Design a protein around this ligand. Structure first.
Ligand SMILES: C[C@H]1O[C@H](O[C@H]2[C@H](O)[C@@H](O)[C@@H](O[C@H]3[C@H](O)[C@@H](O)[C@@H](O[C@H]4[C@H](O)[C@@H](O)[C@@H](O[C@H]5[C@H](O)[C@@H](O)[C@@H](O[C@H]6[C@H](O)[C@@H](O)[C@@H](O[C@H]7[C@H](O)[C@@H](O)[C@@H](O)O[C@@H]7CO)O[C@@H]6CO)O[C@@H]5CO)O[C@@H]4CO)O[C@@H]3CO)O[C@@H]2CO)[C@H](O)[C@@H](O)[C@@H]1N[C@H]1C=C(CO)[C@@H](O)[C@H](O)[C@H]1O
Ligand SMILES: *[C@@H]1O[C@H](CO)[C@@H](O[C@@H]2O[C@H](CO)[C@@H](O)[C@H](O)[C@H]2NC(C)=O)[C@H](O[C@@H]2O[C@@H](C)[C@@H](O)[C@@H](O)[C@@H]2O)[C@H]1NC(C)=O
Ligand SMILES: *[C@@H]1O[C@H](CO)[C@@H](O[C@@H]2O[C@H](CO)[C@@H](O)[C@H](O)[C@H]2NC(C)=O)[C@H](O)[C@H]1NC(C)=O
Ligand SMILES: *[C@@H]1O[C@H](CO)[C@@H](O)[C@H](O)[C@H]1NC(C)=O
Length: 827
């Protein structure tokens, strides 16, 4: 019947003089409790400004090192070398206070508005509000203003809303659990949240990140949020914002900037678990072409392997000679090839990969011997991606395979790690039997369920208990290295399991979703979440992975999915086929929406550049552009592509309209520029949405450079640019275009083989000026890119060279690389 804990008192505390102030304190345990294991008696507590806009609060055992995510994995600045102690800096909005109460507390508030962002003041009678710090139970709690704080993140979980619902528990423990399941912990763990405040100073946003790889539950009740973490330390970062985009800049500066993607990765991808042989995949490619549906990349799932073994080919169904011919043909036709790899290596003694893995001792061990799992080929050992020797092995196996069969990228799956068996716990081990049970799979299921046991060991005598959540991330680092060492092109990989920082290495997809209307909608919050997580190259399996799709659902899904940053149709083997050519209405919608997507390729690519620079997501919440509009905070079924393009999908069967929120102003359909929406105060509009149409609109104030439709992205890149200029009465219009060869390793780097163009448009009382400014004109000029047309929306008078109307300036024949200034007059 003992209390869960008694908390800590401040024994000493002081702010450093003679440098950028930081605060150091020693805390002492008030009293022990047997509940949840041994209390740490003395804690070192530091608060320090890493940058003016980032505060770090680090709480460690004063007398012993504890597990921390290694710097080599996630490189970051090192730690600093009644009564209250205050830490403030003249150039920082964040003010930190240490309260010497019993038990102690701390807060962080804004110097400017006095809004308290994180409030770890305990309620003295209530231990659920204390800092508790036991070897396998860390508890950290903050109160929140229930109506004003709007929280987002804490992945990975499927939810019907993007804004986090009040009164829930979010569990972070990477697990092979299908994303068609609401609420449960899924493949990745992202202990970050964004907190957008509706007042004071509407739209004032901050971020909170707990840099910890251990299993945890995070309980959010609206007026409080509480972390319950089963190991490691508290290493808490607060990002000042104050805009949502600034918070992601600050967060990704810490965890890593989003990796760039090659231009081709924005083309359409096709995959299926169950393609039977090389003839079938060839036929799929042929049928896409016959249907005039763009197809950029053909994928092969585990079917291609010899009995589900990595780095092999089925000699009957996917023989090497035919596969070489297939890939050669793809390449001749401007297409690309991506195969799957699983992490588990089959233990067959006559399998070369196993022999080599054994020779280099690359596998995760338990009880002194390689840990034996079960996955698709049966028995497997798992490479230890924390071990440099295993990463070298992985690089070498990929090289060996690529030397025999060319590939363009890699899909890494099952990397939680997934295990089809659960091993018995080591008797007496509190790692395999932890004192606090996190809510794994929604049933307090033991952490070792269907994975590698916590007592397994990694390089450096690191336990699986501590390193589990890093496995997919580490495999992603190793796989990207393997690709970079075997091709000088910008690489492409897709990973299932992720951790904070994975976006610096890989794309992600939402995993095993289902062919259900619910999942169609769930793809939107998950897409938005992964942007916040610094993983902008995100999408869901179009038409649904599990269960058989329907014509209507698949039609609505390609309509939406054609706007995902990562756009792939994929399916399980036991379902009907769902290639887009199979139903005419799906094929016809696909041609329409992939046509617009392909016209938008230069825009997606520019946004990818922006994401790598500043962390800003490609697919972003409405509140990134309209943070002062509280109505946008709870939107979960619409999203932006870049600043000013909004996608408003139909998400229900039988619907021929959708009630869609429009922020203030004028919005123009990208499918028919004569069709527009104009609102004053933002409100809902019941948009027409017939079976063959999805609503996609561009807001006043924006300029977007398009290219033409084509069946491949390479062909698209050789077409003329058409500039879409949407005027606003209240502000000049702007836009941006980034150009390189589509595949440079270091995007926008000092080598200079790239151009950045900025566009401007402004109305005068009797004229209109449209112009560009160009950085590095040379590259763009040498690539012959032509701007041949400008379309001007948003005015009620026509314009020409010396309700709403549409003006078109044609046959310009100008070089994109040559800065221009065009003066137009009204008619
Ligand atoms: C292709 C694909 O294949 C594989 O995935 C498949 C999978 O194999 C299929 O079986 C299927 O799985 C579905 C399943 O059908 C669904 O039902 C669902 O399951 C979830 C439940 O619906 C949900 O309720 C919950 O279940 C909870 C219970 O709620 C809860 O009651 C409790 O139940 C048990 C506990 O299990 C017991 O341990 C114990 O509980 C104890 C506890 O142990 C103690 O510690 C203590 O606390 O006391 C308690 C209480 O006594 O008893 C309880 C009572 O009975 O826990 C349950 C959880 O254990 O969660 C379920 C999910 O876990 O969803 C699943 C899927 O998650 O479909 C999937 C997907 O198709 C592979 O795994 C997958 O990776 C594969 N996909 C990849 C492969 C390829 C091929 O290369 C690619 O093409 C793909 O792209 C890849 O992604
Ligand atoms: C390890 O790989 C071996 C080579 O692929 C497997 O043996 C081969 O199994 C083929 C298909 O199952 C069979 O047609 C081949 O004749 C045979 N080749 C040789 C050289 O033995 C082996 O499979 C197991 O052992 C053989 C002898 C049979 O009893 C199979 O049914 C077994 O599955 C693989 N070992 C394991 C444990 O899978
Ligand atoms: C683009 O949208 C406009 C506006 O809805 C369409 O023009 C209307 O067409 C209907 C007949 O379908 C006429 O009754 C209206 O008078 C038209 N309105 C205007 C303002 O001209 C136009 O047809 C659409 N374009 C395409 C290619 O579908
Ligand atoms: C015409 O545009 C210029 C800038 O391009 C602006 O400064 C000027 O005021 C405008 N003149 C009229 C008459 O609209």
């Amino acid at each position: 019947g003992e209390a869960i804990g008694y908390g800590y008192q401040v024994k000493n505390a002081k702010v450093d003089n003679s440098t950028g102030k930081s605060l150091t304190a020693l805390l002492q345990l008030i009293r022990n409790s047997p509940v949840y294991g041994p209390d740490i008696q003395f804690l070192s507590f530091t608060a320090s400004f890493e940058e003016d806009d980032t505060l770090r609060i680090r709480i460690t055992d004063a007398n012993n090192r504890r597990w921390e995510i290694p710097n080599e994995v996630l490189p970051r600045p090192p730690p600093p070398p009644p009564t209250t102690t205050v830490l403030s800096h003249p150039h920082s909005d964040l003010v930190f206070t240490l309260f010497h109460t019993t038990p102690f507390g701390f807060t962080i508030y804004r110097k400017s508005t006095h809004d308290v962002l994180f409030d770890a003041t305990p309620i003295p009678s209530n231990p659920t509000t204390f800092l508790i710090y036991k070897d396998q139970y860390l508890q950290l709690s903050s109160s929140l203003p229930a109506q004003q704080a709007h929280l987002y993140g804490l992945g990975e979980h499927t939810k019907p809303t993007f804004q986090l619902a009040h009164n829930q528990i979010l569990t972070l423990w990477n697990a092979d659990i299908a994303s068609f399941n609401r609420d449960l912990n899924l493949y990745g763990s992202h202990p970050f949240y964004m907190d957008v405040r509706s007042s004071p100073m509407v739209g004032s946003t901050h971020g909170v990140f707990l840099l910890n790889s251990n299993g945890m539950d995070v309980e959010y009740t609206g007026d409080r949020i509480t972390y319950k973490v089963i190991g490691g330390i508290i290493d808490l970062y607060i990002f000042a914002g104050r805009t949502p985009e600034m918070v992601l800049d600050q967060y990704t500066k810490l965890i890593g900037r989003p990796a760039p993607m090659p231009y081709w990765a924005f083309g359409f991808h096709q995959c299926r678990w169950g393609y039977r042989d090389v003839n079938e995949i060839e036929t799929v490619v042929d049928k896409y072409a016959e249907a005039r549906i763009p197809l950029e990349v053909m994928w092969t799932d585990i079917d291609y392997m010899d009995a589900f073994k990595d780095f092999t080919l089925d000699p009957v169904h996917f023989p090497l000679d035919k596969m070489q011919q297939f890939v050669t043909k793809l390449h001749r036709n401007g297409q690309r090839y991506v195969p799957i790899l699983d992490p588990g290596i089959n233990t067959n003694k006559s399998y070369g990969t196993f022999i080599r893995g054994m020779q280099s001792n690359v596998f995760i061990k338990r009880d002194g011997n390689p840990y034996l799992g079960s996955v698709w080929p049966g028995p497997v050992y798992y490479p230890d991606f924390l071990d440099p020797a295993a990463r070298s092995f992985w690089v070498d196996e990929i090289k060996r395979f690529r030397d025999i069969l060319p590939i363009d990228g890699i899909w890494i799956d099952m990397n939680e790690a997934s295990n089809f068996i659960t091993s018995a716990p080591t008797p007496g081990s509190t790692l395999d039997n932890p004192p606090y049970k996190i809510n794994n799979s929604g049933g307090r299921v033991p952490i070792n369920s269907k994975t590698i046991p916590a007592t397994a060991m990694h390089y450096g005598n690191v336990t699986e208990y501590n390193a589990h959540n890093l496995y997919g991330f580490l495999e992603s680092q190793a796989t990207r290295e393997a690709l970079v060492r075997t091709s000088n092109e910008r690489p492409f990989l897709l990973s299932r399991s992720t951790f904070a920082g994975s976006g610096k290495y890989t794309a992600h997809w939402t995993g095993d979703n289902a062919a259900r209307w619910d999942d169609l909608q769930y793809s939107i919050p998950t897409m938005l979440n992964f942007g916040l997580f610094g993983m902008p190259m995100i999408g869901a399996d179009i038409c649904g992975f599990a269960e058989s799709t329907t014509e209507e659902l698949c039609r609505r899904w390609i309509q939406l999915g054609a706007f995902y940053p990562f756009s792939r149709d994929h399916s399980a083997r036991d379902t009907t086929h769902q290639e887009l050519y199979l139903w005419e209405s799906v094929a016809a919608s696909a041609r329409t929406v992939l046509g617009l997507r392909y016209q938008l390729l230069p825009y997606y690519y520019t946004l990818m550049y922006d994401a790598n620079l500043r962390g800003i997501p490609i697919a972003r919440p409405l509140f990134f552009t309209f943070p002062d509009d509280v109505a946008t905070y709870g939107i979960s079924s619409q999203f932006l592509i870049g600043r000013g393009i909004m996608v408003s999908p139909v998400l229900q069967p039988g619907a021929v309209s959708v009630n869609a929120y429009f922020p203030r102003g004028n919005w123009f359909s990208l499918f028919n520029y004569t069709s527009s929406v104009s609102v004053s105060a933002g409100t809902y509009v019941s948009l027409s949405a017939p079976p063959d149409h999805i609503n996609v609109h561009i807001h006043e104030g924006n300029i977007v450079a398009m290219q033409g439709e084509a069946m491949t992205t390479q062909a698209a890149r050789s077409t003329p640019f058409h500039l879409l200029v949407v005027m606003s009465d209240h502000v000049a219009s702007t836009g941006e275009l980034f150009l390189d060869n589509g595949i440079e390793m270091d995007i926008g780097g000092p080598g200079g083989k790239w151009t950045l163009v900025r566009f401007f448009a402004e109305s005068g009382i009797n004229n209109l000026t449209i112009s560009s400014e160009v950085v590095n004109r040379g590259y763009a000029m040498s690539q012959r890119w032509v701007m041949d047309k400008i379309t001007i929306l948003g005015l009620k008078r026509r314009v020409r060279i010396k309700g709403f109307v549409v003006s078109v300036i044609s046959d310009l024949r100008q070089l994109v690389g040559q800065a221009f200034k065009l003066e137009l007059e009204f008619e």
